[PDB]
Amino acid sequence: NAIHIGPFSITPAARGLHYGGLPHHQWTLYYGPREMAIKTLPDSYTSSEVRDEFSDIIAEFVIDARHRYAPDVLELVNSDGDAVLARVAVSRLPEALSGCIPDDRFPYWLLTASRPRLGLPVTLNEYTALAVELSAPPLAWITGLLPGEVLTHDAEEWRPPTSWELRHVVGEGSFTGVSGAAAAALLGMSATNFRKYTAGDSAANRQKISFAAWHYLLDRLGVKRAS
Amino acid sequence: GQICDEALQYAARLRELEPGWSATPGCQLHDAEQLWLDPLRAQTDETFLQRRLRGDWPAEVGNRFANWLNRAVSSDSQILGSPEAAQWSQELSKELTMFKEILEDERD
């Protein structure tokens, strides 16, 4: 009786033991193939208690993955160099940056927040254009946990995500927190036709999501901008 | 004021906790502040070094505690250029002066 919380799975050890006189089982928490933890929990534990034993490790994983794959931050400053006027989390860099110290020849500069700064002089209309073009969605860090060939725009190199990669973004335990019904309603599809995507093996009536549906779903969940 | 009292209580509990004052291998300035936090001279401790410790009170160790307080309180041109950081440093100096008076009351 395994337990699935998004991409995580908690499985018991198929033969218990007796600790302190009481029957126990070893539960292993996996994130895909990587084994994350082992606990020894008693029997007569409901599955909610088994979930709330590993919820702390799952939450620390979410904290570390959110901080590690955070998108970049550009800062709009004035001509002196201090006194930040605006910040924008970008998912890409504006391609014309090259290491600059702002002077008073131009009144608005766009620097990286990383310390050997790159920057560019802007004039509040091309800043708005760059911020509209390059901004990052509120859940861009989930793109750090995805293989990168399922996130590409090149249709020749794209391969459809597996069920485990699909469970990062769709499901009640996923990192977006969006159920299969709401994600079916986002794609204009029935809950059953969408549950066909989340089976796991191609024999049990599982077809793969298409290129346009996957990228539009990543757009609508707020994960990839998909311009 | 809570941190100064916690430091005073930790010094008092560390002084009462250790039975002797043990010599340390290669301990300069740790022994230098530990002489200010020292108990009485032991059998291993010399009467001359014990008399030198008893003669001079360790107020300079309190100055080192002020160096610890400057380590604790981050200061810069945002506080040094403003008027509130100087008042915060004055309050910290008054607390350090009260702690230095309480420390120097024992020795000497």
Partner: protein, 334 residues
């Protein structure tokens, strides 16, 4: 569009060695190859409270109680021997050239702009003014800092060493050449042409600089003072430690380098005080004050930014100051 680079680092030219100290008698200086090195020794010191304590204290009894403790310290000292009156200080100075190119830089366009700006400086005039002032600071024994004050006769022998042997010799009386003004002399101009040939990259310059200072028999010399830990007790050099290469008193090479680049006579606050060392916000630590203060537009950063970006090339004196700062090297970045 062009802006200044965020990392910009220059390796220093005019590398000096560490200046070793030795001792001998005057007029034995032409056979001064076996002169023994000045040994750093230890001594005890115990003087009462001479520092200004908080005045108007109505307690003379605590003053008298503090006076009864001698506060014994142990002090490193360096004296001449009793049978020698001349201190011989020897180091080597290498002049390399290539003073415009940074060793690290972010922007390639700013790097090319700065390279061509130093190129137009070099085409407009050579390094001969800066090399003349550096040859003056080699000529007077300014690198003796406190070993020069109160000396009877100081003599500088400068050997240009092309191959393993000496190629040319210069000899100067370092008290004739003052520490104030920059004069002219044919031998000094020949040394300046050698230094300018080194700084232009037209040759490889290695100089051996020996200075003889007639101080007195058994007098006290002043090597570089080290940094002293406050961990130990009142013994074990509790107050003063002197820098030493192996059983020989010595001066730090950056002390020699600070004395060599004391050529800045163009700072706007005064000119009767004499030269100072070239620095961005050119400041002396002995006075605790900053000339080239950046409210005035004469610090190195504003001058270089106006020269390179806006093409507002400053006066030729300030151009000499900027190129002297690039010869000095540094970490110029945000």
């Amino acid at each position: 569009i062009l802006s200044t680079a965020s990392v910009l680092a220059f390796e220093r030219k005019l590398d000096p060695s560490d200046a070793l100290m030795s001792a001998g008698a005057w007029a034995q200086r032409d056979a001064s190859q076996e002169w023994p090195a000045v040994t750093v020794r230890e001594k005890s010191v115990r003087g009462t409270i001479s520092n200004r304590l908080k005045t108007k204290d109505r307690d003379p009894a605590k003053l008298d109680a503090s006076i009864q403790s001698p506060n014994l310290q142990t002090v490193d000292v360096a004296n001449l021997p009793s049978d020698a009156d001349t201190l011989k200080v020897r180091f080597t100075l290498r002049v390399l050239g290539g003073a415009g190119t940074p060793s690290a830089c972010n922007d390639a366009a700013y790097r090319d702009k700065l390279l061509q700006t130093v190129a137009t400086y070099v085409n407009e005039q050579g390094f001969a003014e800066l090399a003349r002032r550096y040859a003056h600071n080699l000529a007077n024994a300014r690198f003796l800092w406190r070993n020069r004050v109160g000396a009877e006769a100081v003599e500088v022998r400068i050997n240009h060493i092309r191959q393993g042997e000496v190629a040319r010799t210069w000899r100067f009386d370092a008290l004739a050449i003052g520490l104030r003004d920059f004069k002219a002399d044919a031998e000094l101009d020949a040394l300046a042409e050698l230094i300018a040939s080194g700084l232009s990259g037209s040759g490889h310059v290695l100089l051996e600089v020996v200075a003889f200072a007639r101080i007195g028999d058994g007098q006290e010399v002043f090597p570089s003072q080290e940094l002293i830990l406050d961990k130990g007790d009142k013994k074990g050099q509790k107050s003063k430690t002197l820098y030493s290469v192996r059983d020989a008193a010595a001066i730090h090479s950056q002390k020699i380098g600070n004395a060599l680049r004391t050529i800045d006579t163009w700072y706007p606050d005064e000119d009767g005080l004499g030269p100072i060392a070239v620095e961005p916000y050119g400041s002396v630590t002995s006075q605790g004050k900053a000339y080239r203060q950046p409210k005035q537009k004469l610090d190195f950063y504003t001058l270089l930014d106006n020269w390179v970006l806006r093409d507002e090339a400053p006066a030729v004196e300030q151009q000499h100051y900027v190129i002297a700062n690039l010869i000095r090297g540094g970490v110029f970045g945000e």
